[PDB]
Structure formats: C-alpha cells, structure tokens
Amino acid sequence: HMCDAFVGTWKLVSSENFDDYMKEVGVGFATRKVAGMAKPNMIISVNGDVITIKSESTFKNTEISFILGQEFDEVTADDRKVKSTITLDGGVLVHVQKWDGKSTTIKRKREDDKLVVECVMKGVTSTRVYERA
Ligand SMILES: C=CC[C@]1(C(C)C)C(=O)NC(=O)N(Cc2ccc(OC)cc2)C1=O
C-alpha cells in the first residue's frame, strides 16, 4: 500500500514557470516550445516493490519503472541521459536526476484531489498540477 494515493491516471490542468525551469535545465528553444504546449497524462501503478510512472503526450511518451532508493538510468523527454533515484520522504515522492555534474529534483505529492509536481533546478521552481482523468 506503498503509494496507494498516487496510483491512477492523471491529467495536467495547470502549469507555472515551466519554460523557465526548462531553460535552467538547458532545454533548447524548439523543444521548450513543443514541450511547453503538451498536456501530458501521468499513469502511476505499483506491482510489488516496482513503481511505474508513464507519461503520454503529443510531445513524447515516456515510462520509468523503479524500486525506491535504487538508482536507475533514465532518458528524459528532453533527451538527457540521467541517473535517477526516487525515494519516499514523508509521503512525497522525491525524484533526483543527475547528469553532467548537474542535478534537478522533481517532487510529487497529493494535495486535496490533486497531484502536485514541483520541479526545481537551482533557484528556479515550476509547479504542475494534475487532476484525476
Ligand atoms: C507527465 C510527467 C511529469 C513531468 C515533470 C516536468 C517532471 C511533467 O509534468 N511534464 C512534463 O512535460 N514532463 C516531461 C518533461 C520533462 C522535462 C523537460 O525539460 C526539462 C521537458 C518535458 C515530466 O516529466
């Protein structure tokens, strides 16, 4: 019953400062424009110890499967090759991505009927709000 309140199919309903987050990450102009238009669905499931997070959009479809605390390699939607570790910290999924001596952290938390995604690169935060599909 690890992550029960996260499981399901979620749709993006609002975003703030995502262009600036992507700039801070190093995403180029054309990818920022197309990625910024997307309205992804996030599909989260659990089977034993394995959590799967899929994102489906008109930009890119991605999927990661992982065990909490256990590093894995990830190719991100913007085509970075990163090493990722996801943990549960006080009920928040905390996803750290490392590449090229850089780091970004993505936090996913349940707040009311929303799943709130906070993405941080250095001093820049973007907040993306999802609702059940
Ligand atoms: C539904 C997924 C969740 C999440 C979130 C940002 C981590 C999101 O809400 N929206 C997305 O587009 N992506 C994809 C993404 C990630 C990084 C990019 O450039 C740095 C560009 C596009 C995601 O991975």
Only one residue has tokens 């600036």, namely 20
Phi-psi region of 4 (alpha: psi -120 to 50; beta: other; left: phi over 0): alpha
Burial of 90 (0-12, 13-18, 19+ CB in 10 A): exposed
Residue of 31, 78, 79, 99 to mutate, ligand 1, most atoms within 8 A of C-beta: 78
Provide the resolution (angstroms): 1.1
Angle of CA points 53, 125, 31, to nearest 5°: 65
Technique employed here was X-ray
Residue 82's CB: how many other CB atoms inside 10 A?
17
Only one residue has tokens 């424009």, namely 33
Report the CATH number that the domain containing residue 89 is assigned in CATH: 2.40.128.20
CA 103–ligand 1 middle distance (angstroms): 15
User: Rounded to the nearest 5°, which phi and psi values hold at 121?
Assistant: -135, 115
Which residue has a Cα nearest atom 11 of ligand 1? 40
Report d(CA 2, CA 21) in Å as an integer.
Answer: 29
Range of the domain at 22: 4-130
Tally of domains in the chain? 1
